[PDB]
Design an enzyme around this catalytic site. Structure first.
Site, PDB file in Angstrom:
ATOM      1  N   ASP A 116     -11.931  -0.334   7.736  1.00 29.04           N
ATOM      2  CA  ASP A 116     -11.344  -0.591   6.411  1.00 29.04           C
ATOM      3  C   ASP A 116     -11.796  -1.956   5.879  1.00 29.04           C
ATOM      4  OD1 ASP A 116      -9.501   0.285   4.346  1.00 29.04           O
ATOM      5  OD2 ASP A 116      -7.874  -0.906   5.204  1.00 29.04           O
ATOM      6  N   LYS A 168       3.619  -2.688   3.774  1.00 31.66           N
ATOM      7  CA  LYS A 168       4.060  -3.710   2.866  1.00 31.66           C
ATOM      8  C   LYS A 168       3.874  -5.075   3.502  1.00 31.66           C
ATOM      9  CE  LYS A 168       7.374  -4.912  -0.176  1.00 31.66           C
ATOM     10  NZ  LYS A 168       8.708  -4.970  -0.698  1.00 31.66           N
ATOM     11  N   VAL A 169       3.492  -6.090   2.723  1.00 33.32           N
ATOM     12  CA  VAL A 169       3.396  -7.467   3.239  1.00 33.32           C
ATOM     13  C   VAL A 169       4.275  -8.328   2.357  1.00 33.32           C
ATOM     14  CG1 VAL A 169       1.951  -9.468   3.836  1.00 33.32           C
ATOM     15  CG2 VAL A 169       1.105  -7.143   4.251  1.00 33.32           C
ATOM     16  N   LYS A 173       4.317  -8.031   7.902  1.00 30.81           N
ATOM     17  CA  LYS A 173       3.898  -6.682   7.573  1.00 30.81           C
ATOM     18  C   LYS A 173       4.937  -5.712   8.164  1.00 30.81           C
ATOM     19  CE  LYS A 173       0.102  -3.379   7.623  1.00 30.81           C
ATOM     20  NZ  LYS A 173      -1.301  -3.152   8.080  1.00 30.81           N
ATOM     21  N   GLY A 227       0.835  -1.193   0.000  1.00 29.62           N
ATOM     22  CA  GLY A 227       0.000   0.000   0.000  1.00 29.62           C
ATOM     23  C   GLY A 227       0.867   1.239   0.000  1.00 29.62           C
TER      24      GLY A 227
HETATM   25  C1  LIG Z   1      -4.822  -8.158   3.637  1.00 28.94           C
HETATM   26  O1  LIG Z   1      -3.782  -8.081   2.642  1.00 28.94           O
HETATM   27  C2  LIG Z   1      -2.890  -7.047   2.725  1.00 28.94           C
HETATM   28  C3  LIG Z   1      -2.860  -6.125   3.765  1.00 28.94           C
HETATM   29  C4  LIG Z   1      -1.947  -5.083   3.743  1.00 28.94           C
HETATM   30  C5  LIG Z   1      -1.080  -4.972   2.677  1.00 28.94           C
HETATM   31 CL1  LIG Z   1       0.087  -3.683   2.668  1.00 28.94          CL
HETATM   32  C6  LIG Z   1      -1.071  -5.890   1.648  1.00 28.94           C
HETATM   33  C7  LIG Z   1      -1.985  -6.952   1.656  1.00 28.94           C
HETATM   34  C8  LIG Z   1      -2.004  -7.914   0.538  1.00 28.94           C
HETATM   35  N1  LIG Z   1      -2.133  -7.451  -0.706  1.00 28.94           N
HETATM   36  N2  LIG Z   1      -2.107  -8.561  -1.481  1.00 28.94           N
HETATM   37  C9  LIG Z   1      -2.220  -8.430  -2.933  1.00 28.94           C
HETATM   38  C10 LIG Z   1      -1.968  -9.691  -0.774  1.00 28.94           C
HETATM   39  C11 LIG Z   1      -1.900  -9.323   0.543  1.00 28.94           C
HETATM   40  N3  LIG Z   1      -1.753 -10.125   1.677  1.00 28.94           N
HETATM   41  C12 LIG Z   1      -1.557 -11.481   1.686  1.00 28.94           C
HETATM   42  O2  LIG Z   1      -1.538 -12.160   0.655  1.00 28.94           O
HETATM   43  C13 LIG Z   1      -1.426 -12.098   3.047  1.00 28.94           C
HETATM   44  C14 LIG Z   1      -1.281 -13.482   3.144  1.00 28.94           C
HETATM   45  N4  LIG Z   1      -1.217 -14.166   4.301  1.00 28.94           N
HETATM   46  C15 LIG Z   1      -1.302 -13.479   5.445  1.00 28.94           C
HETATM   47  C16 LIG Z   1      -1.426 -12.095   5.481  1.00 28.94           C
HETATM   48  C17 LIG Z   1      -1.519 -11.087   6.510  1.00 28.94           C
HETATM   49  N5  LIG Z   1      -1.636  -9.920   5.861  1.00 28.94           N
HETATM   50  C18 LIG Z   1      -1.656  -8.595   6.482  1.00 28.94           C
HETATM   51  N6  LIG Z   1      -1.622 -10.042   4.504  1.00 28.94           N
HETATM   52  C19 LIG Z   1      -1.496 -11.366   4.262  1.00 28.94           C
END
Ligand SMILES: COc1ccc(Cl)cc1-c1nn(C)cc1NC(=O)c1cncc2cn(C)nc12
Length: 278
Positions: free
Chosen positions: A129, A24-25, A44, A20
């Site tokens: 959100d 970043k993730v 994150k 974002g």
């Molecule tokens: C909710 O997703 C996000 C939240 C915040 C930001 Cl900066 C980016 C993403 C996000 N973007 N994309 C394309 C894919 C994302 N995430 C995952 O695949 C993901 C997978 N397993 C555990 C995860 C835990 N989180 C926070 N995200 C997780």
């Protein structure tokens, strides 16, 4: 040994998962044995706001629910360590799995989102959100709320939290009170859930995204929100998704009563969807 303490020396970055404006993730492998057999985790971090990530870490560390992404620990700026869900969010998963995800599965995902959100509200938090991009897919049978970057605690015996800042907001998912007064109630999350349900029912199709549909309804980046508030005040709402039964759309419309105090609760939605699933 603290199982929630991830040493930087063993936390190996593999690839990006998402990014974002500030956050970043990344997919990492926590590999103390150094042979690539360690557990994969989602991490994150912030792009080179620190106080905010520390608050998000502390919120997630205290949430435990089957429909909330699992906290695993920290790496110390600071990074938040979570379980990894390779299917990603509904925004990436649904366009590629329409054949597998029929209406019955969509309604079960809607129940799970409501259960995770109802748990969050029971803990006196407002998410602010809720959108399909923040709903992660564990499997074709399970989803989880997957991010808490905007989450706020509502004070005991207060009904809302006020947020006034210069940050970009997901205005097309925001209830009228959020847009007009920057007030966030648990009922504001119910409004956002109705928009997320619309996304789920359209398989996160970009041409019929909430932003595209509202822009078609309203007709500058600075006058957009006022025309959006006026459209909502006029009683206009996102239309019924293609092939969505009217009974599902009526539950979605109960998320969008103008006044927060008139909207359905998450438990009432769960009961409505379970009745349709019987
Ligand atoms: C909710 O997703 C996000 C939240 C915040 C930001 Cl900066 C980016 C993403 C996000 N973007 N994309 C394309 C894919 C994302 N995430 C995952 O695949 C993901 C997978 N397993 C555990 C995860 C835990 N989180 C926070 N995200 C997780």
């Amino acid at each position: 040994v603290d199982p929630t303490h991830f040493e930087k020396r063993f936390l190996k970055r593999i690839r990006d998962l998402g990014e974002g404006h500030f956050g970043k993730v990344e997919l990492c492998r926590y590999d103390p044995e150094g042979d690539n057999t360690g557990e994969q985790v989602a991490v994150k971090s912030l792009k080179p706001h620190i106080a905010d990530l520390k608050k998000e870490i502390e919120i997630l560390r205290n949430l435990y629910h089957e429909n909330i992404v699992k906290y695993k620990g920290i790496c110390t700026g600071i990074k938040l360590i979570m379980e990894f869900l390779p299917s990603g969010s509904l925004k990436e998963y649904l366009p590629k799995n329409k054949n597998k995800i029929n209406l019955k599965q969509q309604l079960k995902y809607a129940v799970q989102i409501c259960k995770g959100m109802d748990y969050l509200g029971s803990r006196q938090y407002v998410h602010r959100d809720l959108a399909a991009r923040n709903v992660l897919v564990e499997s074709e049978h399970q989803v989880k709320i997957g991010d808490f970057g905007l989450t706020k605690a509502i004070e005991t015996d207060k009904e809302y939290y006020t947020v006034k800042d210069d940050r970009d907001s997901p205005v097309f998912w925001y209830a009228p009170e959020c847009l007009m007064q920057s007030k966030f109630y648990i009922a504001s999350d119910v409004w956002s859930f109705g928009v997320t349900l619309h996304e789920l029912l359209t398989y996160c199709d970009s041409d019929s995204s909430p932003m595209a549909l509202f822009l078609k309804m309203i007709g500058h980046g600075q006058m957009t929100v006022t025309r959006l508030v006026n459209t909502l005040k006029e009683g206009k709402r996102l239309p019924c998704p293609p092939n969505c039964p009217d009974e599902v759309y009526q539950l979605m419309r109960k998320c969008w009563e103008f006044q927060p105090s008139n909207r359905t609760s998450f438990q009432n939605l769960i009961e409505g969807f379970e009745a349709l699933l019987k």
